[PDB]
Amino acid sequence: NSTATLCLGHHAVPNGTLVKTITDDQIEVTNATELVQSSSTGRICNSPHQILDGKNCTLIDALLGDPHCDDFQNKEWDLFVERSTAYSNCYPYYVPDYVSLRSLVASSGTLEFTQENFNWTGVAQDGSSYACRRKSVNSFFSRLNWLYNLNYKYPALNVTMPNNDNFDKLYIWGVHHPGTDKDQTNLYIQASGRVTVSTKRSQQTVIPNIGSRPWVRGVSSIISIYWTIVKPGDILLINSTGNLIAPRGYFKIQSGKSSIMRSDAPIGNCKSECITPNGSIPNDKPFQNVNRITYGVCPRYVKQNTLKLATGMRNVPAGFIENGWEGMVDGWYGYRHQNSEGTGQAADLKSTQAAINQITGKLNRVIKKTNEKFHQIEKEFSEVEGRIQDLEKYVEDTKIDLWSYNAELLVALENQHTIDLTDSEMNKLFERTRKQLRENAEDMGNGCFKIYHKCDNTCIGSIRNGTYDHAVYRDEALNNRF
Amino acid sequence: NSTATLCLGHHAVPNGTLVKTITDDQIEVTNATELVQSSSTGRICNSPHQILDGKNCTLIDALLGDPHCDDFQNKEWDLFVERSTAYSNCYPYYVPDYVSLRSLVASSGTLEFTQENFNWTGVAQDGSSYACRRKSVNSFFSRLNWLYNLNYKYPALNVTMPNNDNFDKLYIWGVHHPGTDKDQTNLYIQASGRVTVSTKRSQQTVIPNIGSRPWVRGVSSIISIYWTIVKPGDILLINSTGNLIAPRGYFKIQSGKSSIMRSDAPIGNCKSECITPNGSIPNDKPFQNVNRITYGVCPRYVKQNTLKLATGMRNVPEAGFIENGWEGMVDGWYGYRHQNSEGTGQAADLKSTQAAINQITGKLNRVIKKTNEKFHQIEKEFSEVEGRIQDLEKYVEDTKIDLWSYNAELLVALENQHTIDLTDSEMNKLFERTRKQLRENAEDMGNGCFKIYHKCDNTCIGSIRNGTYDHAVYRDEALNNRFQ
Amino acid sequence: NSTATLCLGHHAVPNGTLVKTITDDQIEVTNATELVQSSSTGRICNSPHQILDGKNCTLIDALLGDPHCDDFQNKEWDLFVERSTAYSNCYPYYVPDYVSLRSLVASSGTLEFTQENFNWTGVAQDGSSYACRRKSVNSFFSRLNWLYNLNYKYPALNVTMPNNDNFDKLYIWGVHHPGTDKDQTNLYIQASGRVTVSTKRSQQTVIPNIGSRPWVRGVSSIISIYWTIVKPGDILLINSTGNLIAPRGYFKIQSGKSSIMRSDAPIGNCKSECITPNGSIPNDKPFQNVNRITYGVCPRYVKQNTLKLATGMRNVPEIAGFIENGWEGMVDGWYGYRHQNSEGTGQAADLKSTQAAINQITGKLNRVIKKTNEKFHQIEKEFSEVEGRIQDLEKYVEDTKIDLWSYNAELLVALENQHTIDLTDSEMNKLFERTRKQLRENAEDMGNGCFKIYHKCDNTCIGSIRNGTYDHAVYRDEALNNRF
Ligand SMILES: *[C@@H]1O[C@H](CO)[C@@H](O[C@@H]2O[C@H](CO)[C@@H](O[C@@H]3O[C@H](CO)[C@@H](O)[C@H](O)[C@@H]3O)[C@H](O)[C@H]2NC(C)=O)[C@H](O)[C@H]1NC(C)=O
Ligand SMILES: *[C@@H]1O[C@H](CO)[C@@H](O[C@@H]2O[C@H](CO)[C@@H](O[C@@H]3O[C@H](CO)[C@@H](O)[C@H](O)[C@@H]3O)[C@H](O)[C@H]2NC(C)=O)[C@H](O)[C@H]1NC(C)=O
Ligand SMILES: *[C@@H]1O[C@H](CO)[C@@H](O[C@@H]2O[C@H](CO)[C@@H](O[C@@H]3O[C@H](CO)[C@@H](O)[C@H](O)[C@@H]3O)[C@H](O)[C@H]2NC(C)=O)[C@H](O)[C@H]1NC(C)=O
Ligand SMILES: *[C@@H]1O[C@H](CO)[C@@H](O[C@@H]2O[C@H](CO)[C@@H](O)[C@H](O)[C@H]2NC(C)=O)[C@H](O)[C@H]1NC(C)=O
Ligand SMILES: *[C@@H]1O[C@H](CO)[C@@H](O[C@@H]2O[C@H](CO)[C@@H](O)[C@H](O)[C@H]2NC(C)=O)[C@H](O)[C@H]1NC(C)=O
Ligand SMILES: *[C@@H]1O[C@H](CO)[C@@H](O[C@@H]2O[C@H](CO)[C@@H](O)[C@H](O)[C@H]2NC(C)=O)[C@H](O)[C@H]1NC(C)=O
Ligand SMILES: *[C@@H]1O[C@H](CO)[C@@H](O[C@@H]2O[C@H](CO)[C@@H](O)[C@H](O)[C@H]2NC(C)=O)[C@H](O)[C@H]1NC(C)=O
Ligand SMILES: *[C@@H]1O[C@H](CO)[C@@H](O)[C@H](O)[C@H]1NC(C)=O
Ligand SMILES: *[C@@H]1O[C@H](CO)[C@@H](O)[C@H](O)[C@H]1NC(C)=O
Ligand SMILES: *[C@@H]1O[C@H](CO)[C@@H](O)[C@H](O)[C@H]1NC(C)=O
Ligand SMILES: *[C@@H]1O[C@H](CO)[C@@H](O)[C@H](O)[C@H]1NC(C)=O
Ligand SMILES: *[C@@H]1O[C@H](CO)[C@@H](O)[C@H](O)[C@H]1NC(C)=O
Ligand SMILES: *[C@@H]1O[C@H](CO)[C@@H](O)[C@H](O)[C@H]1NC(C)=O
Ligand SMILES: *[C@@H]1O[C@H](CO)[C@@H](O)[C@H](O)[C@H]1NC(C)=O
Numbered sequence A: 001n002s003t004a005t006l007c008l009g010h011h012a013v014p015n016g017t018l019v020k021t022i023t024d025d026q027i028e029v030t031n032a033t034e035l036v037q038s039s040s041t042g043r044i045c046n047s048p049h050q051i052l053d054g055k056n057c058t059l060i061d062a063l064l065g066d067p068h069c070d071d072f073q074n075k076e077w078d079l080f081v082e083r084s085t086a087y088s089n090c091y092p093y094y095v096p097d098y099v100s101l102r103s104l105v106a107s108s109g110t111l112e113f114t115q116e117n118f119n120w121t122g123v124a125q126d127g128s129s130y131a132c133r134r135k136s137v138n139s140f141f142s143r144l145n146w147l148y149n150l151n152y153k154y155p156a157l158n159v160t161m162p163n164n165d166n167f168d169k170l171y172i173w174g175v176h177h178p179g180t181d182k183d184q185t186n187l188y189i190q191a192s193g194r195v196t197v198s199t200k201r202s203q204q205t206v207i208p209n210i211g212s213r214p215w216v217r218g219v220s221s222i223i224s225i226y227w228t229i230v231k232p233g234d235i236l237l238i239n240s241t242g243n244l245i246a247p248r249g250y251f252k253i254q255s256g257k258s259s260i261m262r263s264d265a266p267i268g269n270c271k272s273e274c275i276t277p278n279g280s281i282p283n284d285k286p287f288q289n290v291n292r293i294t295y296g297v298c299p300r301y302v303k304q305n306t307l308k309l310a311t312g313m314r315n316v317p318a319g320f321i322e323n324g325w326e327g328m329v330d331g332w333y334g335y336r337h338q339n340s341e342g343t344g345q346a347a348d349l350k351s352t353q354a355a356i357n358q359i360t361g362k363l364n365r366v367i368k369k370t371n372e373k374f375h376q377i378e379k380e381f382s383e384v385e386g387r388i389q390d391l392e393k394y395v396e397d398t399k400i401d402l403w404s405y406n407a408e409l410l411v412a413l414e415n416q417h418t419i420d421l422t423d424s425e426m427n428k429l430f431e432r433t434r435k436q437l438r439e440n441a442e443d444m445g446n447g448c449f450k451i452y453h454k455c456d457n458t459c460i461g462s463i464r465n466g467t468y469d470h471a472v473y474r475d476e477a478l479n480n481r482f
Numbered sequence B: 001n002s003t004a005t006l007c008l009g010h011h012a013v014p015n016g017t018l019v020k021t022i023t024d025d026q027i028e029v030t031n032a033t034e035l036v037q038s039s040s041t042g043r044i045c046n047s048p049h050q051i052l053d054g055k056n057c058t059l060i061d062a063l064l065g066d067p068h069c070d071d072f073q074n075k076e077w078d079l080f081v082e083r084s085t086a087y088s089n090c091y092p093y094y095v096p097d098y099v100s101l102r103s104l105v106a107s108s109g110t111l112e113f114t115q116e117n118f119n120w121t122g123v124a125q126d127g128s129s130y131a132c133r134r135k136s137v138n139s140f141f142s143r144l145n146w147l148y149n150l151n152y153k154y155p156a157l158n159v160t161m162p163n164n165d166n167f168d169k170l171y172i173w174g175v176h177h178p179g180t181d182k183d184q185t186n187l188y189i190q191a192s193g194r195v196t197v198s199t200k201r202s203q204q205t206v207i208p209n210i211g212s213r214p215w216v217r218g219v220s221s222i223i224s225i226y227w228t229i230v231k232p233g234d235i236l237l238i239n240s241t242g243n244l245i246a247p248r249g250y251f252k253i254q255s256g257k258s259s260i261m262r263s264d265a266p267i268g269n270c271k272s273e274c275i276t277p278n279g280s281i282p283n284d285k286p287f288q289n290v291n292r293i294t295y296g297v298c299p300r301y302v303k304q305n306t307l308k309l310a311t312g313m314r315n316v317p318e319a320g321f322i323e324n325g326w327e328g329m330v331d332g333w334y335g336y337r338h339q340n341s342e343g344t345g346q347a348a349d350l351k352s353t354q355a356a357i358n359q360i361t362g363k364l365n366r367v368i369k370k371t372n373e374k375f376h377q378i379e380k381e382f383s384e385v386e387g388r389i390q391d392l393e394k395y396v397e398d399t400k401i402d403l404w405s406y407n408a409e410l411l412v413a414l415e416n417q418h419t420i421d422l423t424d425s426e427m428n429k430l431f432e433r434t435r436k437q438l439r440e441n442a443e444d445m446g447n448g449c450f451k452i453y454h455k456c457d458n459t460c461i462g463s464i465r466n467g468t469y470d471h472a473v474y475r476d477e478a479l480n481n482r483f484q
Numbered sequence C: 001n002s003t004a005t006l007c008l009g010h011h012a013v014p015n016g017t018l019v020k021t022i023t024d025d026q027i028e029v030t031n032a033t034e035l036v037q038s039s040s041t042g043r044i045c046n047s048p049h050q051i052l053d054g055k056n057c058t059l060i061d062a063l064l065g066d067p068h069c070d071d072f073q074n075k076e077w078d079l080f081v082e083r084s085t086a087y088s089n090c091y092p093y094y095v096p097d098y099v100s101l102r103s104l105v106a107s108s109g110t111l112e113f114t115q116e117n118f119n120w121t122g123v124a125q126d127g128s129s130y131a132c133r134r135k136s137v138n139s140f141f142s143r144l145n146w147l148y149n150l151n152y153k154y155p156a157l158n159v160t161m162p163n164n165d166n167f168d169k170l171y172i173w174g175v176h177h178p179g180t181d182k183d184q185t186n187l188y189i190q191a192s193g194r195v196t197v198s199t200k201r202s203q204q205t206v207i208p209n210i211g212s213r214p215w216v217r218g219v220s221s222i223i224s225i226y227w228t229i230v231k232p233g234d235i236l237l238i239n240s241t242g243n244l245i246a247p248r249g250y251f252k253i254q255s256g257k258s259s260i261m262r263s264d265a266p267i268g269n270c271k272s273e274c275i276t277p278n279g280s281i282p283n284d285k286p287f288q289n290v291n292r293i294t295y296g297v298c299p300r301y302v303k304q305n306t307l308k309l310a311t312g313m314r315n316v317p318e319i320a321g322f323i324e325n326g327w328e329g330m331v332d333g334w335y336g337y338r339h340q341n342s343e344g345t346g347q348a349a350d351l352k353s354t355q356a357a358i359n360q361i362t363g364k365l366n367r368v369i370k371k372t373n374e375k376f377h378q379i380e381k382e383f384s385e386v387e388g389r390i391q392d393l394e395k396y397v398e399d400t401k402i403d404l405w406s407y408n409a410e411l412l413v414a415l416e417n418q419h420t421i422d423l424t425d426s427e428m429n430k431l432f433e434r435t436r437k438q439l440r441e442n443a444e445d446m447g448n449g450c451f452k453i454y455h456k457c458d459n460t461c462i463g464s465i466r467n468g469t470y471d472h473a474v475y476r477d478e479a480l481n482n483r484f
């Protein structure tokens, strides 16, 4: 009755979370947060990025001018979305270096086309095919010009086109490979054509190949597609004696943050910085497990499906040496007392705020939203290729393993640090109380002090308030101790 | 009067090991372990991976059907081992994009061949050569069909072969480059041949080169090798007016964990998950220094040859831990020494010993386990100058190794620092728990020992070590001795 | 005043530096150092690397022998510097795989040329052009030999050149593409030429392409450039029926630490291990923000422009101990005592704790990251032409590398600074505890980092505490009388 008990403690919860540290494989803490984004809504948000739904059209088909891709003329994009249902419906073609043409056009982000008055005197223009009907009429790629004989004559073409602008020009052109020699000589009078497209810095020559081919859309022939970039002040020169699928002009080729993505996710009316083929994902967490293919401001892809970051002290469901206090809801640390006036509880705001202030924004010190990716490498492959594809796969797998390691070590280190800093605040609160009490109390060993003098609620409050004067009670307290 | 001294201490060893921390360049600990695997047995274990010893055969020669590689027909592998002694002994050839063909066949992991009934009516088949003898008679690559004129005629070939299966087909074919014009017109009647192999998605045209070549195995000619992959529902279409080295069928091209490795190490009868060109290596350690070229579940290649991970506390060799550690303590990491009315004694503390040990066991397995399972990767050694693509392959690999070497360096320093800190922490916690027990009955002598101001025999000493010491029993006696 | 006050404290400075830790975005410390090199002199030091200023000549032009590059014949280099003002002034050409040829020659580091006597009987040699004037006379590339018909005849060339040396030979050769068909038949007699260059391990065939070209230096034609490497004991074989731009010999091709760099920085007379396009930079710091393109022993490129590494304790602006405040005015140590007794107040530094903290901070980062970054010929990292796939990969690899090293640098500085704060806070607490153990029952903790010593304790007595020789038993009777 002539003494008092003051216990120092911390809070506890009944439903703790296990996290991982350097010290413990699993340790239960009061609170944690997930660092790996692992789910997507399934929709690609049309804000803030300019999304272009390719629908049934690939970018190359929209580039060449497949009639069912006419709506894409001169359109621009931040992200072009190619659907797996896309198909070709014009004259059969193939693109040597399809991958690079697709990449650089996708990164350019525009299909702005400008016609140029090539002088094709001597030959017939605007060749059409039943295999490429546009609005029920035989037609051809909108951006290409199928040249053929004019009155049984195909004179040698030698056409020039300077680049007198301040920008690079992208020229798409082709070479026709007839199925038979009867086709070859009927279209182009010479028994074999030849196309040479050149600039002051390049030369590209194609010899057409007359030969049977597997029928595609009623046609036994095919077109090879090539591209040429003309720098400012340079000159495009097209020299041909047959089989030339001529350009009608140039595409602007820009540099910027545009790219292309293969996805079947629908485009929704929402706003999201990060786009994956699985759909848009939130970018609050530093890491994501949804897809290695991302566009925008995105969490970094890691192999882990979950990484829990401790946001509270160790959960331990007498003072803090024995146990935590589930009943303390207004603070992380606090006091419990037993004196002449009964029992009471009060939280310590100083130590609680110190622990919280260290834990808030903990992760914003090492990992921020510094991962803004636009056009990158391909990370999914449908064809066997070998060397270049091996390297692309190895680079991406090397990157992911390294960030997965970084993510693992970071969470373990930070969680070790969250435990230690919260353990530290508890000991500091205990030491502040001991130094206040001086020779008026003894450490009972369980996180509680035995105060050797009568100490009513105001006296206990003075200790919690930091205004306890040991000199006032030292005479009374030293008398009871010894 | 009658008092007792109780000292808190930790163990020490005479033969400590130097490790590195964040704090110290080198600090001696009681025990440490190596994290870098630096030696190999010298043998490639034939388990658990399916090893195919190429012996004197490269993979491409086994693919084409070099007669001395006939034993490799239709064989499969997880790891194909190419020896530096391999040689070619058939018709002289070269493969444009040899590297990619070798890679994709190696990654497929099988040489399963399927013959197909190509209709070569109009030409002679099964051309043979003195440069490619099989069973001591003129022959040719087993998987290729040397077509040439039939009775002074080589009609233009137009042969089709649809892919009506569920898988991609790999077709290997060739073009013959005769040494002279006499050779060209005698073999193929036309003055210049032409080979066009096409699919619905591809076209490959080759113009043969009539011209002399360095004499190789009695031949001044050569064959160019090409490959074509035919997707399901697609069709192989072959058009030739001479010089076609025709396919006899297709190879299955599978996807899986198969690869190829250049090594001269022998194949032994053992079990080992990790294979390097130097031989199999253990994969218990997280890092290895043997070879950046690995196959299987492997430690990560680092530039360091040794990384010692502390598995024990700081070593302070030979009362109380403030002064020194106790080599004489062999049954625990922490413990008590006392001097009382009954003499002197020593006893270890199980709680603090177990706390430190449990925190250290599996300490590195909390950050890096054997999640490094690699199979077919990029090439990492090169015998020829190539330029751009090889520059990139080298830069990629050197970037990876530097980053992992940095990771390994920082990890060991961090782990060792934390191992030091946690073991030192257990010592201070043990000393403090003892102080809390003694209350006003003892005083800190400053050297890790308490002066207990009352008679405290071995049972009393044991009660302190066991946590059952009641200070109130002796408080009256102790306070009388402390204060005069 | 029959008592004394002994305060334990640490120093403080008026001009602290903000650093970043795991705990705080900004915390002021007594001292810090910059880890990111962010500035350049603007000049490339001509030592210790052998620098070759390309002037107005690219490496490929110096290789082929453009007349205004004649001064570069047979020169060697550690680093070739291409200026953006370089230009070509000979016959118009293009190099298929220009990047690779530039790369492999730059890595070889020499233009040593050795003439060889090819037998070009039957054709005319040393064709010259108005497009390639040398000393105001029509001329040609110094290292190439333009062959054409000799009196209306171009016989088939079949010229051999064995490599009977112990080193590899690099052969540069070309194929001429006339602008018109009549040009083709006037120069060479055949309507179409053919060039086949072969060795025992390679074959290269070129079919010339007749077609108009943009007029360049009076010429509507062009030359394709190719290269061939002939291993020892191998043989170069050149077979042509027209359009061959023949070699005059071979280049020695070495392996070493040579590279090429695009820069407009001037070359100075100084010494610097690290070269960037912006100029030489010091390599004392582990990181640099100047340029991802480096040559030599260089700091690792990071995206950060500054990373400050704490080299001192927390700065706490200013008797009272360390609990309340730090001591501005302590200039001979990091930690120390302030005392107040009968003779007044005094201050003295503690050398043990000061040296302990300092020894732990010096070279702290060299324990984890040294100058293990020595790079020479690497990949290209800036691009003037659109290329697509391969350039996509080179950009992605470098961007991946920089982000990973930028992450490492950010985490390393935050970790190291947190540990520097913690180790210095610890040294302060250890000194305070060492003093508490010395005083025994003669003093009490006042809570502000100070002890109230309950006995008369002049300066010699205080010095004994600082010196570690204070005997508490001497004053215990006097002190206990005052406490209780
Ligand atoms: C070389 O051989 C190929 C393969 O046998 C020949 O191609 C075949 O040519 C015929 C007639 O041109 C094609 O017939 C057509 O088939 C389509 C299929 O739907 C049908 O709708 C048409 O009414 C027509 O009957 C046949 O499809 C085609 N086969 C392939 C695989 O493309 C080629 O003609 C030969 N070259 C010659 C004879 O010069
Ligand atoms: C173009 O020039 C090359 C090289 O000068 C000629 O190749 C050489 O051809 C002769 C045969 O005429 C080869 O000689 C033979 O050598 C074998 C084994 O070495 C020997 O057993 C025979 O009895 C015969 O003497 C010689 O090896 C070969 N040299 C090389 C480097 O391949 C080639 O014939 C010329 N082309 C034409 C169309 O003349
Ligand atoms: C195919 O068409 C092109 C384009 O017209 C022809 O190229 C042009 O050829 C003329 C005559 O050689 C070049 O003119 C020259 O210009 C220089 C300086 O400007 C001047 O000093 C000369 O006296 C002459 O006027 C013209 O530059 C050139 N155009 C280009 C873009 O290079 C080419 O000749 C034609 N080829 C055939 C086989 O018809
Ligand atoms: C396979 O391709 C060849 C290559 O063109 C075809 O041969 C051509 O046939 C016509 C018929 O008069 C000739 O004018 C061409 O010159 C031939 N080419 C050559 C190189 O001589 C061949 O016809 C094709 N396949 C079939 C079945 O005919
Ligand atoms: C490039 O254009 C030139 C100029 O029109 C072509 O040259 C003519 O070719 C025809 C047919 O071969 C000849 O009858 C003329 O005499 C040529 N004229 C001149 C001025 O040379 C040339 O054929 C074209 N080249 C290509 C590859 O198409
Ligand atoms: C602040 O820290 C820097 C770096 O730790 C100190 O600079 C070092 O000073 C010593 C002098 O003993 C030199 O030998 C080192 O070469 C210096 N290092 C560097 C990187 O400059 C500096 O002394 C500290 N400043 C103060 C006032 O203590
Ligand atoms: C390779 O060199 C041989 C000569 O060594 C060339 O063959 C001669 O070619 C001409 C015309 O093509 C014929 O008149 C001769 O009869 C040929 N000689 C022999 C021995 O065949 C051949 O053209 C060259 N090949 C090339 C340059 O591709
Ligand atoms: C627990 O941590 C999360 C993550 O920061 C936070 O949102 C929440 O407010 C914290 N407190 C709780 C759940 O009481
Ligand atoms: C186009 O070029 C031909 C070439 O013969 C020329 O006759 C004609 O005048 C040119 N026409 C125009 C509109 O430039
Ligand atoms: C996202 O899509 C990829 C392939 O499209 C799939 O492998 C992965 O499991 C998907 N993840 C989620 C969370 O939908
Ligand atoms: C040293 O540490 C290793 C690895 O943890 C352990 O296997 C070994 O038993 C230890 N040795 C001693 C003497 O403690
Ligand atoms: C092969 O095809 C040819 C086509 O010319 C046909 O005449 C012949 O009868 C066929 N024979 C066989 C055995 O397939
Ligand atoms: C392993 O073999 C490779 C290739 O011969 C060699 O570079 C490396 O030094 C060897 N290392 C060991 C540890 O055997
Ligand atoms: C050079 O070539 C001519 C004609 O091919 C030949 O007669 C002569 O012997 C050759 N000389 C040498 C040294 O090879």
Ligand SMILES: *[C@@H]1O[C@H](CO)[C@@H](O)[C@H](O)[C@H]1NC(C)=O
Pocket (backbone or CB within 6 Å): C038, C039, C040, C277, C278, C289, C290, C291
């Ligand atoms: C170095 O030059 C590059 C341009 O090549 C520029 O982007 C960079 O900011 C420069 N850095 C410095 C430190 O001057």
